Amino acid sequence: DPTLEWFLSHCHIHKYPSKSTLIHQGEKAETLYYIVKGSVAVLIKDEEGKEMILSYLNQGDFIGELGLFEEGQERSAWVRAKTACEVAEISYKKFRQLIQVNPDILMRLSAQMARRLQVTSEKVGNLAFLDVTGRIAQTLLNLAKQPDAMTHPDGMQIKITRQEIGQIVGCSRETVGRILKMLEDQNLISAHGKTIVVYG
Amino acid sequence: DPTLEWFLSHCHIHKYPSKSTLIHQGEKAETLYYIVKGSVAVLIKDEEGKEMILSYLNQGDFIGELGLFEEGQERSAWVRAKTACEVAEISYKKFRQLIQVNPDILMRLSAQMARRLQVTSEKVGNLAFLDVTGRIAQTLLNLAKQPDAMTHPDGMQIKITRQEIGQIVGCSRETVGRILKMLEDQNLISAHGKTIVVYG
DNA sequence: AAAAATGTGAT
DNA sequence: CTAGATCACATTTTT
DNA sequence: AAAAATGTGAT
DNA sequence: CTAGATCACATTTTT
Ligand SMILES: Nc1ncnc2c1ncn2[C@@H]1O[C@@H]2COP(=O)(O)O[C@H]2[C@H]1O
Ligand SMILES: Nc1ncnc2c1ncn2[C@@H]1O[C@@H]2COP(=O)(O)O[C@H]2[C@H]1O
Ligand SMILES: Nc1ncnc2c1ncn2[C@@H]1O[C@@H]2COP(=O)(O)O[C@H]2[C@H]1O
Ligand SMILES: Nc1ncnc2c1ncn2[C@@H]1O[C@@H]2COP(=O)(O)O[C@H]2[C@H]1O
């Protein structure tokens, strides 16, 4: 679409390599990111330093927006690159202007925040409402049904560690494994190493 | 401020009585609400029908916005009146126009969604990261330090059932009580009926 | 009058 | 090791 | 070479 | 009654 590239045309593009960190939690916020390609993980931590993945984001997504509507906003979470990334960046100040000349961009952003509020709210329910098994199961279905999931005679195949699965559903790595083994004993999946086949 | 009343001047005001329901979950969304006075609770439910309070909202807050950026959006949660309310209402369609003539209103809304995303994300951490006691404690401190909390020689006094406390932190009513009694045994609070005094 | 909100105490 | 959920009336509290 | 990610099995 | 967390190496897997 036009408008997207007018905005882009006003951003510095940057690349980050997998595992690097685009946004530092609690730092002062003055920039807005747009992921042109690649994948990132928004994550929060606890005192011990244990992590909690609040969400993933991909091509198309805006990052670093929450601290865009009030002076002295600090970053709410850390943003790490899931994969190699190309991210458009633009100053808050600069961006603000674009809006004035074009209120569509601001609308498009807000839609994304709107969508996010739903997922996070949904995720709040999930924890309050489902057990780890239940949560883990759901996570395997979503992943398994994504663009990156792979094809497999018996269903769809995903690749991920029991560590990162635990930081998505909010449980310990040991608990993921005990449950992954139970899900296999129930013939729902087959898991070898980081590879897991969700049957279908 | 000016702009607020220009917007208001384009809304039908309505009153709802405590316990009534302003928004029906899953219904088609076409209206946007603005709370002119009173308090509401955004809540989600599970199959059993058990509730989970995602948040409270008060004078100043917008409601019914998530389903404002895409055709055929359905309400994400139920909205019930905590207290007697006066809520400005305006069609999505109508509202959209105001924005065009004035992009400040749309900005002001987005700020609120932004703020919300933070609290909900924070709330996600809270569950993933704290135990009920920990969660309950935090809830008593927030409530206790609000405009409605009451004054008391020993600290601040709040009034609320162990039922609604459980639907905020996400635990059972029985568990709230066991913990409220433990918090008293630790001399942190004093609880008689719905009344609780958080010491200070 | 009943509903509404709580409490056991065990398990 | 041990935090929560669940149970099903009799007992308080509200509307 | 080590880090990184896992697994026990008990409790 | 019973779902999770925690523990601290020896054992796989990566970078
Ligand atoms: N709950 C969430 N869901 C999705 N993205 C989020 C969430 N919380 C934070 N983010 C993103 O992570 C960023 C962290 O810093 P910012 O507050 O600048 O902006 C935040 C968003 O871009
Ligand atoms: N309540 C929680 N308890 C334990 N780990 C958690 C929790 N919430 C999120 N996590 C994270 O999820 C991760 C799962 O694998 P780890 O045990 O390596 O580390 C865990 C933490 O980083
Ligand atoms: N997590 C949340 N935090 C705050 N308010 C919310 C949240 N989820 C939903 N709401 C409000 O509740 C409304 C439910 O219907 P809508 O999707 O129209 O718009 C939603 C918001 O106004
Ligand atoms: N995981 C959960 N288990 C039980 N109740 C929950 C949960 N998450 C939210 N809730 C709600 O919190 C309420 C606490 O009091 P109740 O037992 O009356 O009913 C409970 C549910 O409506």
CA distance B173 to B167: 8
Name the phi and psi angles at B151, rounded to 5. -80, 155
First to last CA, chain A: 37
CB-defined site of ligand 1, < 6 Å? A 23, 29, 42, 54-55, 63-67, 75-77, 79, 116, 120; B 117, 121
In sequence order, what are the residues at sequence separation of 6 or more whose Cβ sits closer than 8 angstroms to the Cβ of residue A29?
A64, A66, A67, A68, A73, A74, A75, A92
Residues A58 and A104 reside in one and the same domain: yes
Is the domain of B94 the same as that of B145? no
Question: Same domain, yes or no, for A124 and A148?
Answer: no
Mention every residue, 6+ apart, whose C-beta is less than 8 A from residue A44. A25, A51, A52, A54, A76, A77, A78, B121, B124, B125
Method: X-ray
B25 in Cβ contact with B77 (< 8 Å): yes
- Shared domain check, B172 and B126: no
Select from A132, A171, A176 the residue to mutate for testing ligand 2; criterion: most ligand atoms less than 8 Å from CB. A171
B179 assigned binding-site residue? no
Interior angle at CA B71, CA B65 and CA B74, nearest 5:
55
B167 is in an annotated binding site: yes
**Domain span at A147:** 131-199
Asked if A190 contacts A196 with a C-beta cutoff of 8 angstroms, the reply is yes
- Pair B105, B7: CB distance under 8 Å: yes
Residue with tokens 């989600």: B44
Q: CA-CA distance, B183 to A26, in Å (whole number)?
A: 32
B130 lines ligand 4 (CB under 6 A): no
What span, in angstroms and rounded, lies between the C-alpha atoms of B86 and B171?
31
Domain end residue (candidates: B92, B110, B130): B130
Element (H, E) at A85: strand A85-91
Q: In this structure, are residues B26 and B18 in contact, taking their beta carbons and an 8 Å threshold?
A: no
Domain boundary residue, one of A130, A156, A177: A130
Q: Which two tokens stand for residue A132?
A: 């780890």
Same domain? A75 vs A39:
yes
Whether residue A54 and residue B111 make contact (CB cut-off 8 A), yes or no, is no
At A33, the amino acid letter reads Y
* Ligand 1 centroid – CA A64 distance (Å): 6
Residue entry with tokens 């809520």: B87
B83: three-class secondary structure by DSSP: coil
Helices (H), A67-131: 92-101, 103-129
- Do residues B53 and B26 touch, judged by C-beta distance below 8 A? no
Q: What is the distance between the alpha carbons of residues B111 and A66, in angstroms, rounded to a whole number?
A: 8
Q: Identify the residue whose C-alpha is closest to ligand 1 atom 18.
A: A64
**Gyration radius (Cα) of chain B, Å:** 19
Helix/strand/coil for A10: coil
For A55, nearest residue in chain B (alpha carbons): B121
Structure tokens at A181: 């083994």
Q: Are residues B52 and B119 located together in one domain of the fold?
A: yes
Structure tokens at A161: 């560690």
B152 and B178 share a domain? yes
**Cα B3–chain centre separation:** 25
Does A129 sit in the ligand 4 pocket, CB within 6 Å? Answer: yes
d(Cα A180, Cα A136) in Å, to the nearest integer?
8
Across the interface, whether the CB atoms of A110 and B69 are under 8 A apart is answered: yes
Is B15 labeled as ligand-binding? Answer: no
**Alpha-carbon torsion B156, B162, B163, B168, what sign?**
positive
Quote the tokens at residue A162: 């029991």
Amino acid identity at B23 = I
3-state SS class at A45: strand
Q: Is residue A33 within 8 Å of A64, Cβ to Cβ? A: yes
Q: How many domains does chain B have?
A: 2
What distance in Å separates the CA atoms of residue B183 and residue B76, rounded to the nearest whole number?
Answer: 35
Of B68, B99, B114, the CB nearest to A66: B114
Q: Give DSSP secondary structure letters for A49-82.
A: --EEEEEEE-TT-EES-GGGSSTT-B--SEEEES
Check if A119 contacts B (Cβ < 8 Å): no
The amino acid sitting at B104 is D
Burial zone of B11 (CB within 10 Å; 0-12 exposed, 13-18 middle, 19+ buried): buried
**Could you tell me the two tokens for A173?**
């790595």
Q: Which residues contact B109 (CB under 8 A, 6 or more apart)?
A: A110, B62, B65
Residue type, A116: R
Last residue of a domain, one of B83, B101, B130: B130
Nucleotides in chain E near protein beta carbons (<7 Å):
5-10
> Are B31 and B117 members of one domain?
yes
Distance A178 CA to D15 C1' (A): 50
Separation of alpha carbons A24 and A78, rounded Å: 5
Q: Are residues B9 and B97 in the same domain?
A: yes
User: How far does the CA of A95 sit from the C1' of E5, in Å?
Assistant: 42
Are the C-beta atoms of residues B28 and B80 closer than 8 Å to each other? no
**Residue nearest atom 15 in ligand 3 by C-alpha distance:** B75
A172 lines ligand 2 (CB under 6 A): yes
Amino acid at A200: G
We report the CATH number of the domain holding residue A6 as 2.60.120.10
CA dihedral A180, A183, A185, A187 (to 10 degrees): -130
The CATH number of whichever domain residue A166 belongs to comes to 1.10.10.10
Residues A98 and A20 in one domain: yes
Amino acid at position A71, single letter = E
Residue type for A132, please?
V
Q: What is the Cα–Cα distance from B101 to B3, expressed in whole angstroms?
A: 11
Q: Strand (E) positions, chain B?
A: 12-16, 21-23, 31-37, 40-45, 51-57, 62-63, 78-81, 85-91, 150-152, 155-159, 189-192, 195-199
> Do residues B25 and B123 share a domain?
yes
Residues B20 and B109 in one domain: yes
